[PDB]
Design a protein around this ligand. Structure first.
Ligand SMILES: CCCCCCCCCCCCCCCCCC(=O)OC[C@H](COP(=O)([O-])OCC(O)COP(=O)([O-])OC[C@@H](COC(=O)CCCCCCCCCCCCCCCCC)OC(=O)CCCCCCCCCCCCCCCCC)OC(=O)CCCCCCCCCCCCCCCCC
Ligand SMILES: CCCCCCCCCCCCCCCCCC(=O)OC[C@H](COP(=O)(O)OCCN)OC(=O)CCCCCCCCCCCCCCCCC
Ligand SMILES: CCCCCCCCCCCCCCCCCC(=O)OC[C@H](COP(=O)(O)OCCN)OC(=O)CCCCCCCCCCCCCCCCC
Ligand SMILES: CCCCCCCCCCCCCCCCCC(=O)OC[C@H](COP(=O)(O)OCCN)OC(=O)CCCCCCCCCCCCCCCCC
Ligand SMILES: CCCCCCCCCCCCCCCCCC(=O)OC[C@H](COP(=O)(O)OCCN)OC(=O)CCCCCCCCCCCCCCCCC
Ligand SMILES: CCCCCCCCCCCCCCCCCC(=O)O[C@@H](COC(=O)CCCCCCCCCCCCCCC)COP(=O)(O)OC[C@H](O)CO
Ligand SMILES: Nc1nc2c(ncn2[C@@H]2O[C@H](COP(=O)(O)OP(=O)(O)OP(=O)(O)O)[C@@H](O)[C@H]2O)c(=O)[nH]1
Lengths: 62, 139, 98, 99, 459, 61, 347, 60, 320
């Protein structure tokens, strides 16, 4: 499903869930382990915000 | 330039009815010029369609002048300042809104306010400082 | 400015209007082109004959000898477009759109 | 097919031919001369010799002269008991104020 | 000058008739030699500007730029000579012709004594650059980028031409000397207001100012590297040189009118650096970084105070040598990976050890540590701006805080990380690249010892 | 290699109008040799009636 | 056309235009205009194609009436003055008739409509004569009577010329059509200062003629008539395309190229006469000229459009035309800017 | 969403540069679409003659 | 000079040097029918300059030393490749026909120039107004697509209209089964693999589309196989024919001045061959075209203008 057509110019880019790369299974094989990212998987529109060394949406206990 | 004298002779901030009617005439006069050209270069359909094209072109041009003259003059009365260039801007671009109203396009209406208001403000500067566009050969 | 001068220049003015009011016939426009040089000839002659500008009688004939020379080429131009289009109708004289 | 074009040939590994390749061009001998010219006509004479020229230029926008002009003006002014530098810039006696 | 302009012009027939393969050699030889000659002009007398002829003169502001441009000329040669070695001899000769011609205009422009002569060559720099970005560019958006760069510069320059000739008819001569000694009070009036706007907008577009700046991310990124430097390292400062000279007559109207430009630059510089905080192209990262630094120069000029002018030239020279460096850095990767995306080639310190070190000092100079010339320029403007208004330190410092995040951001994303698995064509850095990078950073750190040479015409 | 114009880039310039519209949607570009296609020749050999029919090309038959 | 007849017919146009600039009698000014008109029509009909007949018909129908309108103000001026000497007009409406009549012989105002198609229809060499030699004869009259023309009428027609000329060039494909719109834009440039100062009108004339004649009849050397056809020429003669861009950039008027010669000098004179809004808008719309100038250079030399396999044949051959006076004409149309004081020589 | 998009790459590019391009373009399609009919051309001449001679008061 | 306007002004008339022996006869028959042999014999008997049918490297023959150049550098299309893979996506089929047609333009221009500069007749094998029937035949066979046909017709309309038809065309009909036998006697392996369908497709459109309409502006004298061998007789028939069609009966010096002026400019005669019509079979891209041109300019004799290539040894290069 693409982003809402607010006229912002997002286009038909897929609206992947807002979940940081920190929420990845580390033991799973990753083609880009430093980003826990595989090949060809359509990457998030805001990947350079949810990247490992940036904003992380990992669930806190409280 | 009888029509031009008709407008500019009326002092700013007074006789708003005369200033408006002068504004309609100048706006009306340029309506015939653009419509007559449009009929010429582009041949319309049967005469009723031709006058329909002529009516639309004249209506917008008269309407742009009509509201502009009204607001450009009452603003001087209400704000008690006729000399300010902004006194023409606030109505000069409202003509763009009128153009957008008759063309039904928010973008073209807003952009026309961006441009027409600046030009209308510029016209006020031209009369104030003494600017001349078609200056006589001096040197 | 007397009335006799007026009737000629006004005839030129209406001749000018009809020249550039092409109907669906190039010959008629060429005929309406024919009006002014005669109006120019008439207008020139009254001025020159009245004021006794003796040497200036040159120009009335000088006006006619070359102002008819375009008509020499214009008619052949008209027959030229009528040799390819087969018609002096001016609506087909628009092949140069692009 | 649409178009008849040769594709992107390759990125020629300049190190592959000459193992000591210098990264300036294909031909080794001129390329060997290429550091010998960029280094010699670079670092040596416009960086080192360049620095010594600019760093040791004759004094720029004279300051130690202006520094010099300070001591005798202040020494004269303080010794005879006159304020070391006047408030007015240009002499005010010859000023003709309006009315 | 004649002593620098003539050797510069004489390089043109030399390169054209040079040997088949010795073109890069000889051009590098004498361009370095000409730069050595231009080191002679770094000296300035007490207060009077160094005058040679009626048409040419130098001061303590033009000469620091003159040496920068002539020193740059060797650098574009070596940087571009990597990919240019794979085309016809005439094509390569035509490029060196064009850089030599482009540099020639810059030297003559900076020492121009008549304002009209200044404007002619100032706009004349468009032609050598425009063809560089278009003909030898390596993308598709260059075609639109070249139009954007040409039209933006020209649309602002044309009012200047009308304004400039107006001064000629009214005041008289437009020599930079006679203008200064015959300065008259430009009183506040609507005609003077547009007089002020026309003489200023032309140089503002080439800064660029926040809003009149969209040509830069298109022109700089799409341009070839031999160009990608000059559009960021010298000719942006050419607009700077125009401001500091033309504002001799625009007083005291400047302080009343400067407010829209100050707020646009002072607030937009936070937004522009915010773009750098989230970018995808390394060239665009540095490009928007240049806008933030130039925006700081924009506000700096308009206070028109001794400290601001010094910090203006200090940052102006330092940023050019810096921003030129980063474009060399992005070039090296872009050749190896054949893409400009940042995350594609993460991990370079693991594979290229010294490339990281050069990247470290490159990103450090942009970070502007003390006593680096970048810091000695930004710090001076902050004090000058603070004296103008105490609130501006909130905006001025915010960029200084923000500029730290992005300036180290490509350092982290590219160098400090796991090497990308799929990429396998990274080669040990050629000694040309490292030598070029030393040619950039060694003068910068050496310049730290004596900032008086580059401090401007008010030291 | 640096990007070079392809066939799809040339079609943008190839039309009879750089920036087409509904009016220019059918304007055919001029013939390359500039000789517009000659339409049917307008010559009519009048079949003369005598009395014997006559088919003439101008004056001579 | 038999070369002897072709040479004579051009000489008559050479003679007809020369008669205008050497005549002191109003009739004789009209006299050569009619001879000049009488001689070009066969020159335009060089290929006898239907398009050529269309162009010749349009040119004649828009120029003959102008000569007729030319005669109208002559007698009216004669009626109110009684002198045929080429001087100031002593009756206002005659000169109001005069300026429109001379201009529509030329085409700056809506009068300009005939220039685009007529250039396209006629041959490339025939297009040169109409666009680089037909602009002197009307300007010769306007220069002589520049003393008293109404500034309001002339400047308005000059504004419309550059504004309409630049705007129509953007949406043009056939290089002949861009040529006409470029000429229309430049004619307003040269005639804008005509009421103010006459010397810089002739400056623009020599400057404009050189670049226009060079880049027209260099385009003949390329033997191309469309942007795509001109695009292909990079493979055959890349030097021609490289020279094409230099004059194209000069055509726009970017310093230090000599095409910036008129634009600079015009703004100087109008500013001297306190007219300052007039040049700025005049300079602004010149960007429209540069855009399609730059677009053509984009498709010519700055990039490389796809070529054709059959074009490999042309590489084995060479041109036969001797490009008479072509090579020197680029040099003095793109590099003569430092020779700016030559303005006083024209006075 | 803001800064890089919206304001830049959308707004600042659609206000000054592209709108001027659009304005220069909308009437470019117009002033280059003359139908080629001689009647229309000469009729425009009539108006241009008529408005200039007396209606604009260009005579005096 | 090379028949400039000065030459015709000073008296270089063209119809003055024309004699009845000035003929532009062409001998065009079926595939492998020995028409070239009959064309050669006609030239030997009369005063006609024989022009054997132009090939891929006929342009190479008339330029430089006449040495054929690289196929890619001189056409990029090879006849035998079209034989093996007529349906190949490389477009060698249409490129072969289109380049050959351009070679026909050069052949006609050379024949017309020599005819109008010396008065000697010319006999041609498969002149300009012949290649179009094979293009139609190759189209219906399916070797090329429709868009090749419209493009080729565009070249024919633009270019061939500027030239003039032959006097009397010579046609040879040899039946397709014998032609399919005639290919076998040759023995060139690329020449056996051609199908009888294309050979049939050559012949039917031949008798339906070449002989009928060329007959209007130039008479056709059919010579079957038995009289194709006969050569003494065939000359008598062409001598007994006044060529009352086309423009030769009403050709003057004026049109001849224009004809030679265009023909002498060899660039002009095929200037309209490189129409910007972009076809997948013919459209060489920018990088490929640029690289080939660099190969062309590096070749000897072509670096500079003819007579100005010092590589070959043009002395006085500083004073010419
Ligand atoms: C201002 C500063 C700049 C300008 C300075 C002055 C120089 C102006 C000319 C520059 C060069 C132009 C040129 O030829 O460019 C190459 C360029 C290439 O042309 P081309 O492809 O070789 O084709 C040329 C003909 O179409 C070929 O047609 P053809 O094959 O039928 O050959 C005919 C040709 C060749 O000559 C002949 O055939 C000779 C005829 C001999 C018999 C008659 C004898 C008696 C008359 C003798 C006259 C001499 O003669 C003519 O065309 C007659 C006109 C030229 C001679 C007479 C000139 C006037 C006196 O020329 C053209 O495109 C045509 C130019 C026509 C003449 C110029 C007209 C415009 C002038 C504007 C500026 C005028 C001054 C303003 C002040
Ligand atoms: C007194 C009140 C003062 C103001 C209070 C502000 C509270 C927020 C401060 C931000 C903290 C720094 C930061 O960006 O941290 C995010 C992140 C580190 O996250 P962490 O939880 O350490 O996890 C790392 C992985 N395990 O590190 C990163 O994501 C690093 C890469 C991205 C960095 C972006 C930093 C943007 C900062 C903008 C601040 C603007 C507002 C400043 C307000 C205060 C001004 C004085
Ligand atoms: C202080 C004294 C004056 C006081 C009064 C203020 C001035 C007079 C009133 C305003 C005049 C300028 C504003 C424009 C008026 C004409 C508007 C018009 O004609 O609108 C109709 C049409 C717009 O739509 P269109 O482009 O046709 O597309 C849709 C088609 N279905 O457009 C058209 O059909 C025409 C093409 C577009 C417009 C072209 C330019 C027209 C205006 C020229 C300048 C007029 C200046 C007048 C004032 C100064 C001189 C007195
Ligand atoms: C000075 C007069 C110049 C007239 C030039 C006429 C030819 C070029 C302009 C044209 O054809 O139309 C311009 C104007 C607006 O045209 P519009 O009605 O908006 O229709 C556009 C889509 N066909 O249509 C007009 O008729 C307006 C022409 C005068 C504008 C001032
Ligand atoms: C002001 C702004 C700038 C204006 C000018 C800008 C020009 C370039 C702009 C970009 C153009 C488009 C992109 C490139 C197009 C290239 C065009 C071209 O034809 O390129 C290929 C071609 C091949 O070379 P070729 O024609 O064989 O000639 C070789 C030399 N004989 O190459 C050529 O044909 C080029 C031939 C160059 C010839 C150079 C001659 C030099 C002569 C030097 C004399 C030295 C005298 C010294 C005297 C000393 C004592 C005083
Ligand atoms: C692309 C849009 C513009 C971009 C931004 C450009 C800069 C903004 C300002 C625009 C105007 C620049 C032109 C300035 C000309 C010289 C200015 C000067 O020296 O001041 C004169 C004032 O200048 C002017 O009067 C003209 C400039 C004001 C603006 C009006 C014209 C420019 C705006 C329209 C054209 C440009 C916009 C694009 C149109 C497509 C002083 O003369 P004066 O008025 O005192 O004359 C003596 C006497 O008092 C009466 O004359
Ligand atoms: N595309 C194309 N191929 C042609 C043309 N004329 C000849 N060919 C080819 O030329 C090749 C060799 O010539 P042949 O057709 O065998 O014989 P010919 O020269 O026509 O006649 P003979 O001399 O009697 O053998 C064949 O593959 C033909 O298809 C032409 O106009 N177009």
């Amino acid at each position: 499903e693409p982003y809402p057509d607010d006229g912002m110019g997002y286009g038909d880019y897929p609206k992947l869930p807002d979940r940081s790369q920190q929420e990845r299974d580390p033991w799973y094989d990753w083609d880009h382990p430093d980003l826990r990212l595989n090949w060809g998987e359509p990457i998030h529109w805001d990947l350079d915000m949810y990247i490992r060394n940036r904003v992380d949406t990992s669930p806190t206990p409280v | 330039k009888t029509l031009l004298h008709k407008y500019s002779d009326i002092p700013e901030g007074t006789e708003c009815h005369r200033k408006a009617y002068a504004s309609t005439s100048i706006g009306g006069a340029t309506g015939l010029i653009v419509s007559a050209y449009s009929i010429a270069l582009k041949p319309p359909a049967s005469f009723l369609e031709g006058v329909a094209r002529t009516g639309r072109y004249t209506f917008t041009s008269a309407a742009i002048g009509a509201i502009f003259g009204l607001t450009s003059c009452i603003s001087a009365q209400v704000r008690e300042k006729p000399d300010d260039p902004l006194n023409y801007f606030i109505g000069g671009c409202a003509g763009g809104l009128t153009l957008g109203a008759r063309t039904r396009s928010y973008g073209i209406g807003a952009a026309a306010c961006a441009y027409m208001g600046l030009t209308a403000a510029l016209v006020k500067m031209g009369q104030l400082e003494g600017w001349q566009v078609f200056a006589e050969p001096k040197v | 400015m007397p009335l006799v001068y007026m009737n000629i220049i006004m005839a030129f003015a209406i001749a000018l209007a009809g020249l550039l009011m092409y109907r669906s016939h190039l010959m008629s426009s060429l005929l309406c082109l024919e009006g002014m040089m005669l109006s120019l000839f008439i207008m020139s002659t009254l001025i020159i004959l009245n004021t006794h500008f003796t040497l200036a009688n040159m120009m009335p004939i000088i006006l006619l000898v070359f102002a008819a020379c375009e008509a020499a080429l214009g008619l052949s131009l008209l027959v030229m477009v009528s040799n390819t289009y087969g018609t002096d109708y001016v609506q087909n004289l628009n092949l140069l759109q692009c | 097919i649409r178009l008849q074009e040769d594709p992107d040939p390759e990125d020629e590994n300049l190190y592959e031919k000459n193992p000591d390749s210098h990264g300036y061009d294909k031909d080794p001998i001129v390329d060997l001369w290429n550091m010998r010219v960029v280094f010699f006509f670079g670092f040596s004479i416009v960086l080192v010799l360049g620095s010594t020229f600019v760093a040791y230029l004759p004094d720029y926008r004279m300051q130690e002269w202006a520094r010099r002009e300070a001591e005798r003006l202040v020494k004269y002014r303080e010794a005879n008991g006159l304020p070391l530098m006047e408030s007015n810039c240009f002499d005010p006696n010859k000023i003709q104020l309006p009315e | 000058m004649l002593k620098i302009i003539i050797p510069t012009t004489m390089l043109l027939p030399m390169t054209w008739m040079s040997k088949h393969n010795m073109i890069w050699i000889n051009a590098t030889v004498h361009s370095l030699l000409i730069s050595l000659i231009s080191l002679s002009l770094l000296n300035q007398l007490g207060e009077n500007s160094l005058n040679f002829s009626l048409t040419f003169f130098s001061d303590s502001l033009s000469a620091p730029l003159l040496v920068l441009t002539t020193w740059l000329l060797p650098l574009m040669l070596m940087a571009s000579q990597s990919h240019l070695s794979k085309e016809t001899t005439t094509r390569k000769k035509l490029y060196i012709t064009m850089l030599i011609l482009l540099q020639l205009f810059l030297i003559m422009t900076f020492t121009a004594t008549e304002l009209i002569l200044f404007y002619i060559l100032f706009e004349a720099t468009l032609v050598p650059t425009l063809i560089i970005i278009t003909r030898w560019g390596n993308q598709t958006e260059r075609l639109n980028a070249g139009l954007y760069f040409l039209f933006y510069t020209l649309a602002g320059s044309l009012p200047l031409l009308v304004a400039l000739v107006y001064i000629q008819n009214t005041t008289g001569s437009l020599n930079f000397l006679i203008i200064h000694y015959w300065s008259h009070p430009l009183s506040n009036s609507w005609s003077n207001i547009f007089m002020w706007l026309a003489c200023i907008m032309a140089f503002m577009v080439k800064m660029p100012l926040y809003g009149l700046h969209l040509w830069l991310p298109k022109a700089h990124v799409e341009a070839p590297i031999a160009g990608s430097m000059v559009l960021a390292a010298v000719l942006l400062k050419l607009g700077g040189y125009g401001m500091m000279r033309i504002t001799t007559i625009l007083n005291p109207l400047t302080n009343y009118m400067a407010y829209p430009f100050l707020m646009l630059s002072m607030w937009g510089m936070i937004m522009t650096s915010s773009i750098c905080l989230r970018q995808t192209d390394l060239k665009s990262l540095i490009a928007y970084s240049s806008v933030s630094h130039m925006a700081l120069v924009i506000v700096a000029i308009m206070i028109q105070t001794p400290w601001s002018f010094m910090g203006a030239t200090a940052l102006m020279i330092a940023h050019g040598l810096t921003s030129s460096m980063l474009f060399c850095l992005a070039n090296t990767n872009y050749e190896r990976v054949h893409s400009r995306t940042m995350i594609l080639a993460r991990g370079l310190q693991t594979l290229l050890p010294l490339m990281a070190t050069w990247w470290l000092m490159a990103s450090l100079t942009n970070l502007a540590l003390p006593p680096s010339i970048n810091l000695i320029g930004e710090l001076f403007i902050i004090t000058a701006s603070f004296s103008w208004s105490n609130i501006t330190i909130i905006l001025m410092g915010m960029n200084m805080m923000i500029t730290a995040l992005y300036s180290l951001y490509m350092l982290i994303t590219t160098q400090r990380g796991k090497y990308t698995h799929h990429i396998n064509n990274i080669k040990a850095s050629f000694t040309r690249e490292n030598a070029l990078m030393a040619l950039h950073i060694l003068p910068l750190l050496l310049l730290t010892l004596n900032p008086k040479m580059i401090l401007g015409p008010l030291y | 290699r640096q990007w070079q114009p392809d066939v799809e880039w040339a079609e943008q310039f190839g039309g009879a109008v750089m920036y087409p519209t509904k009016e220019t949607a059918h304007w055919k570009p001029p013939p390359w040799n500039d000789v517009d296609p000659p339409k049917d020749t307008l010559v009519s050999n009048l079949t003369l009636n005598f009395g014997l029919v006559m088919e003439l090309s101008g004056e001579m038959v | 056309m038999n070369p002897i007849i072709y040479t004579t017919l051009i000489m008559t146009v050479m003679s007809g235009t020369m008669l205008v600039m050497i005549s002191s009698h109003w009739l004789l000014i009209w006299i050569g205009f009619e001879m000049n008109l009488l001689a070009m029509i066969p020159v335009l009909m060089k290929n006898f194609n239907p398009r050529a007949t269309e162009a010749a018909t349009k040119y004649f129908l828009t120029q003959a009436t102008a000569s007729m309108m030319l005669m109208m103000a002559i007698i009216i001026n004669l009626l109110y003055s009684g002198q045929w000497t080429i001087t100031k007009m002593f009756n206002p409406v005659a000169m109001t008739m005069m300026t429109m009549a001379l201009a529509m012989k030329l085409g700056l105002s809506p009068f300009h409509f005939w220039v685009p198609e007529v250039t396209q229809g006629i041959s490339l060499q025939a297009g040169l004569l109409l666009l680089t030699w037909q602009k002197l004869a009307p300007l010769s009259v306007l220069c002589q009577i520049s003393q008293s023309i109404n500034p309001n009428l002339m400047l308005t027609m000059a504004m419309l010329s550059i504004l309409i000329g630049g705007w129509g060039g953007l949406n043009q494909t056939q290089l002949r059509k861009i040529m006409a719109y470029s000429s229309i834009a430049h004619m307003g440039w040269m005639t804008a200062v005509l009421p103010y100062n006459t010397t810089m009108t002739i400056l623009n004339l020599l400057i404009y003629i050189t670049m226009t004649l060079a880049m027209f009849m260099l385009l003949i050397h390329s033997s191309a008539t469309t942007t795509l056809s001109l695009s292909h020429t990079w493979n055959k003669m890349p030097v021609i395309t490289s020279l094409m861009m230099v004059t194209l950039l000069s055509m726009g008027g970017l310093p230090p190229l000599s095409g910036f010669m008129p634009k600079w000098m015009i703004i100087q004179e109008m500013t001297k006469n306190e007219s300052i809004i007039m040049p700025t808008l005049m300079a602004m719309t010149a960007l429209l000229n540069l855009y399609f100038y730059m677009r053509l250079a984009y498709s010519s030399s700055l990039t490389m459009f796809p070529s054709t396999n059959n074009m490999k044949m042309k590489w084995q051959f060479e041109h036969t035309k001797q490009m008479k006076l072509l090579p020197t004409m680029i040099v003095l149309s793109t590099l003569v800017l430092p020779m700016t004081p030559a303005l006083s020589s024209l006075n | 969403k803001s800064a890089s998009s919206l304001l830049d790459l959308i707004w600042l590019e659609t206000i000054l540069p592209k709108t001027t391009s659009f304005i220069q373009m909308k009437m470019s399609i117009m002033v280059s679409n003359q139908k080629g009919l001689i009647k229309l051309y000469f009729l425009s001449f009539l108006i241009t003659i008529m408005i200039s001679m007396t209606l604009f008061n260009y005579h005096e | 000079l090379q028949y400039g306007p000065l030459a015709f002004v000073l008296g270089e008339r063209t119809t003055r040097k024309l004699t009845e022996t000035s003929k532009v006869i062409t001998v065009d028959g079926n595939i492998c029918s020995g028409k070239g042999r009959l064309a050669r014999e006609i030239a030997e008997k009369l005063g006609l300059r024989h022009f054997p049918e132009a090939g891929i490297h006929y342009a190479d023959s008339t330029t430089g030393d006449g040495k054929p150049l690289d196929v890619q550098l001189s056409g990029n299309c090879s006849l035998e490749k079209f034989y093996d893979d007529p349906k190949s996506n490389d477009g060698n089929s249409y490129r072969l026909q289109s380049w050959l047609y351009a070679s026909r333009l050069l052949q006609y221009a050379d024949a017309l120039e020599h005819l109008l500069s010396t008065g000697q007749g010319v006999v041609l094998e498969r002149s300009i107004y012949s290649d179009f029937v094979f293009l139609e035949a190759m189209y219906r066979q399916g070797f090329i697509r429709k868009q090749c046909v419209e493009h080729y017709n565009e070249v024919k309309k633009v270019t061939a209209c500027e030239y003039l038809p032959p006097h009397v065309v010579v046609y040879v009909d040899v039946p397709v089964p014998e032609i399919q036998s005639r290919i076998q006697k040759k023995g060139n392996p690329h020449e056996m693999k051609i199908t009888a369908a294309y050979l049939q497709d050559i012949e039917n459109a031949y008798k339906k589309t070449f002989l009928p309409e060329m007959s209007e502006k130039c008479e056709v004298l059919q010579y079957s196989a038995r009289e194709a061998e006969d050569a003494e007789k065939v000359v008598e028939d062409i001598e007994y024919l006044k060529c009352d069609k086309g423009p030769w009966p009403d050709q003057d010096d004026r049109t001849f001045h224009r004809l030679r002026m265009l023909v002498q400019n060899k660039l002009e005669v095929l200037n309209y061959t490189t129409i910007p019509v972009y076809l997948p079979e013919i459209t060489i891209g920018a990088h490929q075209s640029d690289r080939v041109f660099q190969k062309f300019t590096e070749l000897p004799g072509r670096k500079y203008s003819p007579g100005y290539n010092e590589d070959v040894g043009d002395k006085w290069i500083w004073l010419k």
